[PDB]
């Protein structure tokens, strides 16, 4: 895969391909899309990968 | 392109790139040289015995008319990064030597002006800067060849007075051409340390008071302060002063920490009243027991003290400042005493007549000390008919004092009047063709730049620079090179040995070195990134 | 129990693992090379102790004033000596150090380290085997930890404090990451975390 | 005010998957206007 | 007109993807490189940059240029961050690293527009980088003449080379000799904190001086410091952290007095406590007393009458250096002073260099520090000089411990391209277009070392190609003669680590750019 | 000092770089419509008139250009239609690359 260069709401630049940290910087407001993003937190907490 | 890419998207590299400016080419170099011409055109107008004055109007409306380049260039509102450096050049010369506040700007400008043709000839900008070093070494080496002095700083001060006359001749105080030359010599030689060749700038104070005339400027072998005798009926004359320098107020001693005295009984209230009265008596008698007859105090007095000072015939003044009591104690050979109870005769100062001077209708009450014992400090008292001539007189004597200090530091001198500059230009030209590998054009440009000084001097003297330069340069070659210069009135012949035009060797050595270095650091630039408007 | 220390420098090949803890503070002293490394950790500041109610000094006469300051020097000397006599090599605090505390630290050749982070103090105590004392320095006998080599070094133009354990290795590990950019070092750290979690 | 050197002032471009799927989505949207005007049980539309 | 849902996913976020984003990222790197293209080589030019305060900086070091450009583009910042590292790790690796890293992207720029997915480019960059670095190690030269004049000459040649591309023309023999000897004054840590540089305006470059000891600038004094003569031929130095004011308090005491007998006793006690401290300082020989804390009027007169000098408010940075320069210690309390804590020197004088007063120490044989005093005709003139001294010290410090050096100029870069071409011509397939691109970028150094000053760049580069392919590989570009010269025989040497780290940093920079496909910029910026 | 021309003057590498960009901005239009594997364009004017085409001639006739370096490529396409009648796509692609 390819890297993203993401600048968050604090004007900080994060360059990575790890979705666990990309999704934390994307300011998703859609009331339903949030739920599929939040699910990824339980995956990271339980095993830390995937 | 910026703000437009080949794909139609914006292209942003640096913040607010649309408000920036960059131009490199040869245009940065021509812009720097051109801006320097504006600076050189200013200072060339105040060079030589006919130099014209400038009127500087400050941001607050204050106005002063001066000749001193340090006062002209320091009051500029020029918003150009290289022109600001031209001011720093005059500052470095002022700090190290104190003479060539006009010369280093005119010389450095000529090096930038003559360099213009060298860029148009296709010579690499850096090769030009290096070429000036090869020629500068030649002028410097020959500058040290012709030099002689008979000054011993003991009694044969004739060439030292002449040096002061040469410096002061350019100022607005020629009505005191001799008087101020002698004051400057006496001021330095009475405080200078002959052992190390050091002169402490703090040992010569310069004071003044508006009124009178320049001819009334005197050198006082002592100190001048603002006198204000605490008791208005105290005699104003002391014939033989035994001076107590004290840094404690004439009031009952208090602790420095939180005190909060507890008073309970009437016996406590009344007993304190008695004890405090005794403290006022003791602090005054402790002075008289030492034989003192004049007290000088950093602090003020209580009302109780003023009466005791009267009854004990003990004159005193009040609220004398930090540096004033420091200088008084040194000038009088005494010491500063912390407290009243530490007073002793061994720390008293010794001085002769103590008097205050009243000036016209005012109440200035300035001190004069007539006699002293092996004092190492002097005071200059400048008079004048208006505020502007007095402030300019301060700078005029400053320059005279500085060139005396320079001779003490190094007693090697050269002949002025342009003789040193023309001789250097001829010497560089002779070696400029040994050998014309690449630098032939650059070394000749340096030699031509050296002539900017006798040429500007000739113009301000009312002479044609071609008719004057061609004669002097020929005469310095047809015969063994004499100290032949130029002047306005010619004074007969232009023999600098007979006109007594004396300049310091170390002065000119710094003018050449500092001007050359300043030119280098502003030639070797091809990119200026100055911001524009805020938004 | 696995930490990451990011130090700007050359590429990834210069990364390594260090059996101990690395801090990015200075010593504020001249005892930077410690070989016996008996470590005493305290939570109190190294500047004395005052009351909690209020505190005010009242003086009635001159002898009470003149001899007051001398009492402070006598107390501070004994307090530092109490741990010097027990072999203290390093004293670690979260607070500031007094001018007199530096006077005595140099007298008794004891190195000081200031760690403002409460977690750094807690991790250090668990690493070296020490107890943090909330009170002024007693003659600590058994609460001191042990390292094998405690030193300072300039790595990547940053001076760091190293508490190295060669014998008691399996207490904590620090993975030191080098790189030419912060972006590289931050991304490599994420790879380190994936490995730690996978294990 | 010195302008930016551009070509085709005040024009826009869209290309790639945003068009390939964009134009199809536009056709899908308009297609629904008369979805209910096919069979014998249609309803009336008041325009 | 397409992203028009009834409910937005995020807010207003900009997003680019694909080939125009990669081309834009490479283009941003090419543009920022322009800031240093003209700064490379002995004939480079300086730049003048004005900050928001109105103050200009004149410099040519990449580690000072790139930090003032106000770069905002996410990709252009990449070539700045790598400068931050090379400033620590190497020093010389500034302009050369930025220019090479930018060229690595230019060489592949015409290919990444048409396929050639970055996954294969990154792998080729890693292969070529490892090949180039190993080649340096196989050709670097060392010496076996340690602790001899041969090592002094090596260090001097390293310093004179390090001083290239500065505001220095004929002063190399002046500064270089002092840099080499100044570093040899240090202990076996060679810690740079032991070497100070201080600027004193007035005089020429050749008038600077290296002082084995330390000096302070004579800060705020009181009435009474015109006294205390400044002539000492064998002083001892007391470095104290003691307050010598009458108004020194504990800030928490109140002295409650109930009778006049104690009123006077407290007034006398406050004066007696101050004198007690002063008398303990006396009887020591410490004719020079220095402290970071104030020394008041009473102490000033006490010391004067005792024929002693003092000066307070000395910064801690100079007191620590003074301790190491005078061979003594710093004591906080005066109650335990002795002759075993004082410093010693031979000369202590107050001079007037540039008009300002300076108090110089010299003569201590056990001086672990030194100070280099710069003289010049302007603030910016000396500031640029200071920078040239920091780099020369850094190169010499490293050369003492690592004697592995390589030819300067473009000589090594030409040989590296030769080795890589020999490699690439034995590899089949797509690698031929990728290893070659890495090698071709290596000529940016001998090219720019000519473009900035002529030297007939086209033909002199052809000469390097003809020579290195047939004979020796130490041939580079001369400055005096507009042709090829042998840098090895001319002793134009640079530490091997300068190029080794340059290759690593430049390679990683390229991999950070070509590995990105998408950029996401949050709209929230206030 | 400067020229007293009341407009805007650029010399040296400024125009030598801009003409490359302007030429590329035109070749980038027709490069995507070369060969049977190319795709069509839809051109929509300000008032709503929609034209479908993929030929270099119609596209460059309808699309406005401003940079004087871009008009050269537009004229080149017009000449091809007059002289030959067809092939009007490679003359812009090749000509732009010659400048690059």
PDB file of C-alpha atoms in Angstrom, chain B residues 114-224:
ATOM      1  CA  UNK B 114      34.592  51.439  -9.354  1.00  0.00           C
ATOM      2  CA  UNK B 115      33.531  47.779  -9.091  1.00  0.00           C
ATOM      3  CA  UNK B 116      30.527  48.548 -11.318  1.00  0.00           C
ATOM      4  CA  UNK B 117      32.600  48.452 -14.512  1.00  0.00           C
ATOM      5  CA  UNK B 118      34.249  45.201 -13.402  1.00  0.00           C
ATOM      6  CA  UNK B 119      30.927  43.334 -13.338  1.00  0.00           C
ATOM      7  CA  UNK B 120      30.042  44.716 -16.782  1.00  0.00           C
ATOM      8  CA  UNK B 121      33.383  43.384 -18.078  1.00  0.00           C
ATOM      9  CA  UNK B 122      32.283  39.866 -17.108  1.00  0.00           C
ATOM     10  CA  UNK B 123      34.533  39.429 -14.066  1.00  0.00           C
ATOM     11  CA  UNK B 124      33.120  36.953 -11.556  1.00  0.00           C
ATOM     12  CA  UNK B 125      31.650  38.851  -8.565  1.00  0.00           C
ATOM     13  CA  UNK B 126      33.891  36.946  -6.146  1.00  0.00           C
ATOM     14  CA  UNK B 127      37.074  37.440  -8.196  1.00  0.00           C
ATOM     15  CA  UNK B 128      36.429  41.180  -7.859  1.00  0.00           C
ATOM     16  CA  UNK B 129      36.216  40.861  -4.065  1.00  0.00           C
ATOM     17  CA  UNK B 130      39.450  38.850  -3.950  1.00  0.00           C
ATOM     18  CA  UNK B 131      41.231  41.250  -6.304  1.00  0.00           C
ATOM     19  CA  UNK B 132      40.672  44.090  -3.842  1.00  0.00           C
ATOM     20  CA  UNK B 133      42.603  42.109  -1.216  1.00  0.00           C
ATOM     21  CA  UNK B 134      45.672  41.809  -3.449  1.00  0.00           C
ATOM     22  CA  UNK B 135      45.692  45.584  -4.053  1.00  0.00           C
ATOM     23  CA  UNK B 136      44.779  46.516  -0.470  1.00  0.00           C
ATOM     24  CA  UNK B 137      47.837  44.685   0.894  1.00  0.00           C
ATOM     25  CA  UNK B 138      50.038  46.876  -1.321  1.00  0.00           C
ATOM     26  CA  UNK B 139      48.533  50.143  -0.050  1.00  0.00           C
ATOM     27  CA  UNK B 140      48.751  48.974   3.574  1.00  0.00           C
ATOM     28  CA  UNK B 141      52.388  47.852   3.316  1.00  0.00           C
ATOM     29  CA  UNK B 142      53.436  51.204   1.831  1.00  0.00           C
ATOM     30  CA  UNK B 143      51.334  53.175   4.330  1.00  0.00           C
ATOM     31  CA  UNK B 144      53.704  51.981   7.095  1.00  0.00           C
ATOM     32  CA  UNK B 145      56.826  52.975   5.137  1.00  0.00           C
ATOM     33  CA  UNK B 146      56.587  56.762   5.582  1.00  0.00           C
ATOM     34  CA  UNK B 147      56.084  57.629   9.258  1.00  0.00           C
ATOM     35  CA  UNK B 148      57.945  59.587  11.940  1.00  0.00           C
ATOM     36  CA  UNK B 149      57.237  61.321  15.249  1.00  0.00           C
ATOM     37  CA  UNK B 150      59.146  63.250  17.909  1.00  0.00           C
ATOM     38  CA  UNK B 151      56.370  63.150  20.509  1.00  0.00           C
ATOM     39  CA  UNK B 152      57.534  61.943  23.934  1.00  0.00           C
ATOM     40  CA  UNK B 153      54.427  62.948  26.000  1.00  0.00           C
ATOM     41  CA  UNK B 154      56.565  64.763  28.601  1.00  0.00           C
ATOM     42  CA  UNK B 155      57.024  68.404  27.604  1.00  0.00           C
ATOM     43  CA  UNK B 156      57.609  68.505  23.820  1.00  0.00           C
ATOM     44  CA  UNK B 157      53.897  68.457  23.049  1.00  0.00           C
ATOM     45  CA  UNK B 158      54.106  70.767  19.996  1.00  0.00           C
ATOM     46  CA  UNK B 159      53.254  67.953  17.485  1.00  0.00           C
ATOM     47  CA  UNK B 160      50.525  66.781  19.884  1.00  0.00           C
ATOM     48  CA  UNK B 161      48.886  70.222  19.913  1.00  0.00           C
ATOM     49  CA  UNK B 162      49.264  70.275  16.117  1.00  0.00           C
ATOM     50  CA  UNK B 163      47.427  66.943  15.849  1.00  0.00           C
ATOM     51  CA  UNK B 164      44.553  68.399  17.882  1.00  0.00           C
ATOM     52  CA  UNK B 165      44.519  71.446  15.586  1.00  0.00           C
ATOM     53  CA  UNK B 166      44.322  69.218  12.497  1.00  0.00           C
ATOM     54  CA  UNK B 167      41.328  67.362  13.942  1.00  0.00           C
ATOM     55  CA  UNK B 168      39.529  70.444  15.290  1.00  0.00           C
ATOM     56  CA  UNK B 169      40.130  72.388  12.063  1.00  0.00           C
ATOM     57  CA  UNK B 170      37.253  70.454  10.484  1.00  0.00           C
ATOM     58  CA  UNK B 171      34.799  71.410  13.248  1.00  0.00           C
ATOM     59  CA  UNK B 172      32.728  74.541  13.933  1.00  0.00           C
ATOM     60  CA  UNK B 173      34.913  75.669  16.833  1.00  0.00           C
ATOM     61  CA  UNK B 174      37.790  77.282  14.897  1.00  0.00           C
ATOM     62  CA  UNK B 175      37.102  80.470  16.863  1.00  0.00           C
ATOM     63  CA  UNK B 176      38.879  78.440  19.574  1.00  0.00           C
ATOM     64  CA  UNK B 177      41.314  76.761  17.165  1.00  0.00           C
ATOM     65  CA  UNK B 178      44.151  77.163  19.688  1.00  0.00           C
ATOM     66  CA  UNK B 179      42.216  77.290  22.967  1.00  0.00           C
ATOM     67  CA  UNK B 180      40.441  73.940  22.577  1.00  0.00           C
ATOM     68  CA  UNK B 181      43.580  72.287  21.171  1.00  0.00           C
ATOM     69  CA  UNK B 182      45.427  73.148  24.394  1.00  0.00           C
ATOM     70  CA  UNK B 183      42.518  72.092  26.627  1.00  0.00           C
ATOM     71  CA  UNK B 184      42.376  68.668  24.957  1.00  0.00           C
ATOM     72  CA  UNK B 185      46.120  68.076  25.406  1.00  0.00           C
ATOM     73  CA  UNK B 186      46.082  69.106  29.074  1.00  0.00           C
ATOM     74  CA  UNK B 187      42.959  67.027  29.778  1.00  0.00           C
ATOM     75  CA  UNK B 188      44.494  63.738  28.621  1.00  0.00           C
ATOM     76  CA  UNK B 189      48.140  64.081  29.707  1.00  0.00           C
ATOM     77  CA  UNK B 190      47.084  64.853  33.293  1.00  0.00           C
ATOM     78  CA  UNK B 191      45.159  61.556  33.580  1.00  0.00           C
ATOM     79  CA  UNK B 192      46.843  59.224  31.070  1.00  0.00           C
ATOM     80  CA  UNK B 193      48.796  56.236  32.383  1.00  0.00           C
ATOM     81  CA  UNK B 194      52.221  56.452  30.743  1.00  0.00           C
ATOM     82  CA  UNK B 195      53.189  52.994  32.027  1.00  0.00           C
ATOM     83  CA  UNK B 196      50.666  51.008  29.958  1.00  0.00           C
ATOM     84  CA  UNK B 197      49.708  53.749  27.417  1.00  0.00           C
ATOM     85  CA  UNK B 198      46.118  53.487  28.676  1.00  0.00           C
ATOM     86  CA  UNK B 199      43.699  56.398  29.076  1.00  0.00           C
ATOM     87  CA  UNK B 200      40.578  55.785  31.163  1.00  0.00           C
ATOM     88  CA  UNK B 201      37.630  57.570  29.554  1.00  0.00           C
ATOM     89  CA  UNK B 202      35.936  57.953  32.953  1.00  0.00           C
ATOM     90  CA  UNK B 203      38.676  60.266  34.262  1.00  0.00           C
ATOM     91  CA  UNK B 204      37.669  63.121  31.922  1.00  0.00           C
ATOM     92  CA  UNK B 205      34.164  64.474  32.511  1.00  0.00           C
ATOM     93  CA  UNK B 206      32.548  66.951  30.108  1.00  0.00           C
ATOM     94  CA  UNK B 207      30.011  69.421  31.507  1.00  0.00           C
ATOM     95  CA  UNK B 208      28.357  72.534  30.141  1.00  0.00           C
ATOM     96  CA  UNK B 209      25.945  75.382  30.844  1.00  0.00           C
ATOM     97  CA  UNK B 210      24.121  77.468  28.252  1.00  0.00           C
ATOM     98  CA  UNK B 211      25.385  81.030  28.035  1.00  0.00           C
ATOM     99  CA  UNK B 212      28.550  82.982  27.403  1.00  0.00           C
ATOM    100  CA  UNK B 213      30.856  82.105  24.530  1.00  0.00           C
ATOM    101  CA  UNK B 214      33.098  79.286  23.341  1.00  0.00           C
ATOM    102  CA  UNK B 215      36.158  81.284  24.458  1.00  0.00           C
ATOM    103  CA  UNK B 216      35.005  80.812  28.075  1.00  0.00           C
ATOM    104  CA  UNK B 217      35.517  77.025  27.983  1.00  0.00           C
ATOM    105  CA  UNK B 218      37.937  76.062  30.757  1.00  0.00           C
ATOM    106  CA  UNK B 219      39.678  72.963  32.097  1.00  0.00           C
ATOM    107  CA  UNK B 220      39.005  72.551  35.822  1.00  0.00           C
ATOM    108  CA  UNK B 221      41.480  70.518  37.880  1.00  0.00           C
ATOM    109  CA  UNK B 222      38.712  68.936  39.931  1.00  0.00           C
ATOM    110  CA  UNK B 223      35.028  68.022  39.933  1.00  0.00           C
ATOM    111  CA  UNK B 224      31.816  69.922  39.146  1.00  0.00           C
TER     112      UNK B 224
END
